[PDB]
Design a protein around this ligand. Structure first.
Ligand SMILES: O=c1cc[nH]c(=O)[nH]1
Length: 223
DNA sequence: TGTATCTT
DNA sequence: AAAGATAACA
């Protein structure tokens, strides 16, 4: 057992020996020697430990991890107990409450329950320097996460990609819009939420598009 | 202070 | 690229 889930390591292995990835890991390690980097080393790839790669039905793509202490744990927008849901997640829960009739605030912020159902909780960038949002962008993470999205685009059919925010939206051109469903809206952060996130209804829409492809819907309350 | 996105 | 401007709030 390790950082990468079995199936994900098998299909993403070709990236490890590539110059951009070797250099990206070197940079992250060098940042960790001078600064505090989120999430810790063992939780950078938690998004690979929740379900098998070919069991992925939905993909929620965010910007980068949370930049405050004990927040980011490798699943986009998630926080493990007893850490309270950060501003972005409180907004996600509010949208979920107006979108899904049965959804109520779960009293915690751990999104592992969605991830176990086949919802890939990925960020365009997988690490961040403490207190500095998007500090690790354009260092190599985008090419790695492009490889993840590309693999899913090529080897699967009828996936629902939820691209939240400008940076997450850059991956739109890596997805075949006729073979997969791409839903795009503003980032749930208070600084952008009013630009389309509130009222986007991505959760009910995902479940409707899944049932049209003959797949089982996501129980958003299973947390 | 702190939690995006468009403009210059 | 990076910083200013804009923008919404317990
Ligand atoms: O994981 C996270 C947290 C905040 N914002 C994101 O885009 N992703």
């Amino acid at each position: 057992m390790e950082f990468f889930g079995e199936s994900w390591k098998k299909h993403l292995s070709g990236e490890f020996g590539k110059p951009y990835f070797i250099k990206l890991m070197g940079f992250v390690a060098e940042e960790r020697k001078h600064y505090t980097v989120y999430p810790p080393p063992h939780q950078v790839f938690t998004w690979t430990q929740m379900c098998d790669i070919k069991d992925v039905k939905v993909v929620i793509l965010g910007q980068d991890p949370y930049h405050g202490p004990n927040q980011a744990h490798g699943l986009c927008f998630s926080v493990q107990r007893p850490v309270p849901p950060p501003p972005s997640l409180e907004n996600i829960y509010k949208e979920l409450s107006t979108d899904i009739e049965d959804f109520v605030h779960p009293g915690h912020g751990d999104l592992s329950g969605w991830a176990k159902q086949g919802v890939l909780l990925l960020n365009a960038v997988l690490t961040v320097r403490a207190h500095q949002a998007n500090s690790h962008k354009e260092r190599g993470w985008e090419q790695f996460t492009d490889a993840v999205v590309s693999w899913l685009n090529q080897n699967s059919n009828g996936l629902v990609f939820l691209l939240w925010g400008s940076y997450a939206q850059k991956k739109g051109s890596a997805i075949d819009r006729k073979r997969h469903h791409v839903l795009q809206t503003a980032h749930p952060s208070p600084l952008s939420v009013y630009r389309g996130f509130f009222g986007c209804r991505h959760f009910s829409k995902t479940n409707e598009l899944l049932q049209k492809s003959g797949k089982k819907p996501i129980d958003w309350k299973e947390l």
